[PDB]
Amino acid sequence: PLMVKVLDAVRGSPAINVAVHVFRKAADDTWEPFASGKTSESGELHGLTTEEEFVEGIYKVEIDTKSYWKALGISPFHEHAEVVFTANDSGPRRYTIAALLSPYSYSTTAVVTNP
């Protein structure tokens, strides 16, 4: 139900080995760690959760873009790219969170499908 895809707009390639941390907001308001992983050679990260665990809630996906650029010798603008959204408010959906990275810019898009 949740996939993250990261692309590099400088090289026109997948952004490989990008760390991603996902959090869910608890009923106390705090950000509870929910899942993490790193992007594969295709720039994708699958397997973060399951339909049953991925309940309604407010989720945050934090993509460690700074470390990605630093490893390429670049000092980028952003510390990270953070995507915050309410999920499954009108029933279960599949979410693809895509990010397109440049040193001084990022774009993010959600593709939401009803399986």
Place this chain on the structure above:
Amino acid sequence: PLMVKVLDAVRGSPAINVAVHVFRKAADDTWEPFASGKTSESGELHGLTTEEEFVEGIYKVEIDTKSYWKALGISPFHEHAEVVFTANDSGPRRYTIAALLSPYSYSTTAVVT
């Protein structure tokens, strides 16, 4: 030293009356809110800080995109758009944070001079 500009990709216009909150990261790793405003008729927000107060640090700019889309009667995906950056790491700079908004996508860019 800090300006925010917001555009609406649906209407082809400045995004007017968008709330923007700015925070500085505190020593305890919490976000200390210290400036806010809303975008003008040109989609711009000026006057958030001054040269003397805008010292090196990590800053967060939160743009209340959800409220903007709700006011237009359009279903949005994100809660907000957040920009987090280390400022002034090599000297004081002028920063323009530009955001281009769609209901299920946004982009943000920094123009640093």
Place this chain on the structure above:
Amino acid sequence: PLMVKVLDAVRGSPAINVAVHVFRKAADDTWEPFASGKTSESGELHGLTTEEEFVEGIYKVEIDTKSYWKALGISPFHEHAEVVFTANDSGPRRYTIAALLSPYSYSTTAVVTNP
């Protein structure tokens, strides 16, 4: 070797049934029709060419974004989204041309892989 993917940034979905026309620039400078098709239910168009036909050259991918919006009742800004690029200049590559559509904006990205 050539795939086109189109997404709708208003609904967070694939842009389905989008017409795409591909042209190649001839040695006379004119744009020669090369391939066409329409995006599937996943927003993707595959099967446009083959490794052997997709020689070095300058290609244009024209995505009929206006008709897509018009069918949704919208009068968009752009007539189309046109992506023009030199292909295979340093040997055969696979190209994914992605476009992200809004009524008054579009983004386009190339992912280029070496198989």
Place this chain on the structure above:
Amino acid sequence: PLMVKVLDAVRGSPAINVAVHVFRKAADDTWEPFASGKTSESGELHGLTTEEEFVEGIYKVEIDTKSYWKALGISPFHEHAEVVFTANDSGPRRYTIAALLSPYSYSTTAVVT
């Protein structure tokens, strides 16, 4: 009535000295070039046309992105970025064509007032 603004997503700056050519579609479906310029130190190009000459029609704005990246020593994907639009269909408007450039990606947006 027509301004072009170009930003560089790699450097976090205006894209300076970028060539821009504007064309109007002719009755024979050919593109008739009629204005050009290059972006200023602020990434902007003003003064392309006037209210009287900018009549309804289909216009193309071609931004020479390839030359810009070559001048920076960066390998680019696209030949150029092209924006094609019908102008003034509902009255005269002011158009700002904004482009945000990366070597393998670009976005373009219209701000129409």
